[PDB]
Scaffold this active site. Structure first.
Site, PDB file in Angstrom:
ATOM      1  N   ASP A 458      40.541  11.981  56.402  1.00  0.00           N
ATOM      2  CA  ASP A 458      39.397  12.751  56.037  1.00  0.00           C
ATOM      3  C   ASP A 458      39.350  13.401  57.449  1.00  0.00           C
ATOM      4  OD1 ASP A 458      36.704  13.642  55.085  1.00  0.00           O
ATOM      5  OD2 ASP A 458      36.314  12.306  56.732  1.00  0.00           O
ATOM      6  N   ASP A 665      35.395   7.750  57.083  1.00  0.00           N
ATOM      7  CA  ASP A 665      34.562   7.691  58.395  1.00  0.00           C
ATOM      8  C   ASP A 665      33.105   7.869  58.145  1.00  0.00           C
ATOM      9  OD1 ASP A 665      34.195  10.356  57.314  1.00  0.00           O
ATOM     10  OD2 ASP A 665      34.642  11.416  59.097  1.00  0.00           O
ATOM     11  N   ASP A 669      33.089   9.843  52.535  1.00  0.00           N
ATOM     12  CA  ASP A 669      34.445   8.929  51.932  1.00  0.00           C
ATOM     13  C   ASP A 669      34.404   7.886  50.941  1.00  0.00           C
ATOM     14  OD1 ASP A 669      36.149  10.899  53.503  1.00  0.00           O
ATOM     15  OD2 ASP A 669      36.021   9.826  54.895  1.00  0.00           O
TER      16      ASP A 669
END
Ligand SMILES: [Mg+2]
Length: 774
Positions: A458, A665, A669
């Site tokens: 990400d 993170d 996500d």
């Protein structure tokens, strides 16, 4: 809430208060239906969503408040009750295994140790009527609780495999106790009837198998991982109270009181004091302020909101009270969509079929057929009289010897270490990972992480950035480096932008790089804050010009070569990746941007070496995503992707096979982190990402990902070997149990070295914690 509410009365134990509440609610018109659950001290109120509001109902409930308690009505459920449930499960399994040991260890000792030991070995030989011994009766009495009382689970498992056509671990693999116990009872009864019958009992095997299987279940519960998950963090991200805003402005009188956000409805207004987390999604009436949108975007750039714009629940404003008319609430909020995706992913992971169950499915038929074949072979050999007659023990016939050699196969062919294989590899793997800084909550991650072929990263805090910072500075304004930093800090003295603050810390880093921070700066006068241009300010009466060529021209500063060289992709046109930062005169600029990688490049290279491809799914600008993809080396890249889009990407990749793993993170996500085969979270990230994943990474490092994958590979090795060694001695003593040795040698079967191979198997099921993955 607005659809149906479970009004659970607090401090109410008498039906009279419930009846008064019922009368008050019936006196109010608007509720579609009132389910009167007299038993349970709770009431269900169902009515059309998006009308009126639960506030009137709550006030009606509170109107009935009388001593000795206060009548509060809201949905009460025990939160984080899974932690207590895990403690209950651990206590239950531990105490049951301890009871099994308390009944088995005496059996094993009285059977194997005392007969050989010093004078107290004939105490378990003092005969009774015929050849029944005290030892046999005592072993029977002690082992009987183990076989039956503690074996209810095993018998009900076997009965649950009645006709379903399967042989789980609760079938003859663990029910060889049932055969050994009945054979031992036959031996004891015959010794009671017969006169010589020099035989031995098999009560050891039943108790030991039960103890080892209970130990396997206990260790499986221990190694199952941390207590499920915690979706409560998602709700805690939403505010608990909101400032009702019918205050002065036209059709809004005075209100400032804090009312529960769950009680808010449509067509409502909240102002959100600057420095407050916005309760619910809405559309702004008037107000300019910056918000830290991270639930959807995921980045930290302050998004500026003007009147007429929208707002997403969960963020915090900083530039004034911004009155907002409330849009969709409850289950229609974006946070609601995120939550629903989370539990949809959670209640979609079918538990992995344990390889022990598969083996037992393909092992019980083998054992039963082998035992039947030995019985038939010895029966034929006795009926046709091939083997010598003197081989048969005293007071026994050919059929009895055939039964002995048949049941011997069933007794020896008992897994007795099959349940101890996976737990006593997952536990060691988790311990060593915690030692290496990779805390893996859940063994399911251990088995499903070895076959990962795709990984999805990400960008806004996973692979590149810890927090925005300046990189790649060059001399500007044709001034010394220390006095470059002097200009930088002087310009920063009045600006407090997040990028400006990052410039402050990076200037301090440069200062301490020149030995130490040299003194301090002078204040910057005339903090004009030129729109579009940037920060123009007289630093000790000299105008610093942190801003683009327009700010250069407003102070009549020329243009040079590098002025057209360091932005766009990241380092192509406008002289600085996200800002300009020329200061007063032109000789260069800086490169404030997000950090690139501490190690990520080599981590991605090594992942590609092992065959695991990488896909980047970020929620930032396309240019930055392309830049990072070109830099680190990730081929496939997707930008401006909402969490729902992340979940869709995970679903597509999964539909193409290739079990995926997402490294997360933050809030962005979590849906994909829960929807992936295994979840990876960066420890430096936020709490929700840590919770939603299966393999949290303690230290913020992409190398932790490859450490986790390598650990999973080495624990999928050393576990098939564990199963091999658990099958091992048992399946190699099956021929010995059958009898192929007695024709050749003189020993039939050592009674002690028949059950005393399960100890060797258990010791052979041992794992070493030496990973050394670099
Ligand atoms: Mg991110």
């Amino acid at each position: 809430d607005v659809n149906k509410v479970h009004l659970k009365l607090e401090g109410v134990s008498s039906p009279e208060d419930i009846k008064l509440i019922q009368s008050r609610l019936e006196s109010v018109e608007g509720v579609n239906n009132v389910e009167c659950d007299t038993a349970g001290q709770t009431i269900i109120v169902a009515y059309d969503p998006d009308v009126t509001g639960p506030r009137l109902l709550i006030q009606c409930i509170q109107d009935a408040a009388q001593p000795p308690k206060y009548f509060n009505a809201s949905l009460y459920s025990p939160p984080k009750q899974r932690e207590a449930e895990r403690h209950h499960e651990i206590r239950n399994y531990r105490n049951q295994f301890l009871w099994s040991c308390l009944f088995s260890v005496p059996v094993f000792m009285f059977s194997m140790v005392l007969p050989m030991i010093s004078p107290f070995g004939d105490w378990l030989f003092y005969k009774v009527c015929n050849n029944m011994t005290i030892g046999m009766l005592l072993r029977w009495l002690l082992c009987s609780p183990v076989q039956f009382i503690i074996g209810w689970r095993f018998y009900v498992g076997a009965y649950h495999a009645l006709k379903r056509g399967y042989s789980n671990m609760d079938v003859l693999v663990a029910l060889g106790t049932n055969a050994a116990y009945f054979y031992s009872v036959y031996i004891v009864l015959k010794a009671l009837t017969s006169e010589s019958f020099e035989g031995q009992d098999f009560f050891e095997t039943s108790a030991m198998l039960i103890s080892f299987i209970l130990l396997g279940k206990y260790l499986e519960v221990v190694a199952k991982g941390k207590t499920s998950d915690a979706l409560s963090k998602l709700t805690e991200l939403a505010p608990e109270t909101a400032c009702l805003l019918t205050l002065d402005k036209d059709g809004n009188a005075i209100s400032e009181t804090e009312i529960s956000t769950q009680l808010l409805q449509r067509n409502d207004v909240i102002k959100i004091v600057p420095g407050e987390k916005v309760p619910v999604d809405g559309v702004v009436i008037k107000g300019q302020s910056h918000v830290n949108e991270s639930m959807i975007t995921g980045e930290a750039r302050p998004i500026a909101k003007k009147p007429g714009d929208k707002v997403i629940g969960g963020t915090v404003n900083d530039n004034g009270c911004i009155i907002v008319k409330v849009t969709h609430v409850g289950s229609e909020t974006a946070l609601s969509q995120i939550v629903q995706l989370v539990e949809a992913a959670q209640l979609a992971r079918a538990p992995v079929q344990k390889l022990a169950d598969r083996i037992s499915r393909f092992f019980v038929p083998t054992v039963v057929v082998a035992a039947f074949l030995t019985w038939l072979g010895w029966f034929v050999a006795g009926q046709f009289d091939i083997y010598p007659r003197e081989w048969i023990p005293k007071a026994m016939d050919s059929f009895e010897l055939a039964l002995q050699f048949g049941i011997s196969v069933l007794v020896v062919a008992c897994p007795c270490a099959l349940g101890l294989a996976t737990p006593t590899a997952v536990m060691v793997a988790t311990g060593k990972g915690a030692s290496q800084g990779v805390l893996i909550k859940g063994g399911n991650a251990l088995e499903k992480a070895h076959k990962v072929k795709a990984i999805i990263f990400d960008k806004t805090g996973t692979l590149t950035v810890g927090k925005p910072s300046v990189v790649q500075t060059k001399v500007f304004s044709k001034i010394p480096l220390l006095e470059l930093c002097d200009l930088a800090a002087g310009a920063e003295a009045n600006s407090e932008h997040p990028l400006s603050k990052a410039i402050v810390e990076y200037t301090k880093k440069l200062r301490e790089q020149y030995g130490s921070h040299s003194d301090h700066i002078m204040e910057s006068k005339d903090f004009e804050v030129h729109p579009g241009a940037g920060v123009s300010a007289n630093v000790e009466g000299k105008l610093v010009l942190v801003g683009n060529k327009r700010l250069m021209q407003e102070f009549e500063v020329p243009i040079s070569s590098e002025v057209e060289g360091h932005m766009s992709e990241t380092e192509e046109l406008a002289r600085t990746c996200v800002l300009v930062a020329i200061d007063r005169t032109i000789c260069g600029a800086l490169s404030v941007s997000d950090p690139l990688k501490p190690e990520a490049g080599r981590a991605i290279s090594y992942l590609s070496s092992m065959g695991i491809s990488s896909i980047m799914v970020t929620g930032d600008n396309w240019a930055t995503a392309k830049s990072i993809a070109k830099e680190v080396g990730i081929g496939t890249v997707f930008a401006e992707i909402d969490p729902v889009g992340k979940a869709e990407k995970i679903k597509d990749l999964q539909m193409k096979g290739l079990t995926v793993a997402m490294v997360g993170d933050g809030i962005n996500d979590s849906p994909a982190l829960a929807a992936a085969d295994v979840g990876l979270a960066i420890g430096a990230g936020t709490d929700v990402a840590i919770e939603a994943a299966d393999i949290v990474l303690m230290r913020s490092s992409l190398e932790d990902v490859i450490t986790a994958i390598d650990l999973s590979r080495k624990t999928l090795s050393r576990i098939r070997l564990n199963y091999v060694w658990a099958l091992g001695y048992n399946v190699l003593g099956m021929p010995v149990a059958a009898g192929v040795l007695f024709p050749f040698t003189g020993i039939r079967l050592p009674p002690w070295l028949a059950g005393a191979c399960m100890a060797a198997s258990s010791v052979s099921v041992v794992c070493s914690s030496l990973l050394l993955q670099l």
